[PDB]
Amino acid sequence: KKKLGFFLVTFGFIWGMMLLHFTIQQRKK
Numbered sequence: 001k002k003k004l005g006f007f008l009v010t011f012g013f014i015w016g017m018m019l020l021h022f023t024i025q026q027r028k029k
Helices: 002-028
Strands: none
Touching: none
């Protein structure tokens, strides 16, 4: 759970980076 724990934190960041591009995709189409 030591390594997996730190990796699990990054997983959440993904939802944020993809949510950003999602807003732009709407602009284009």
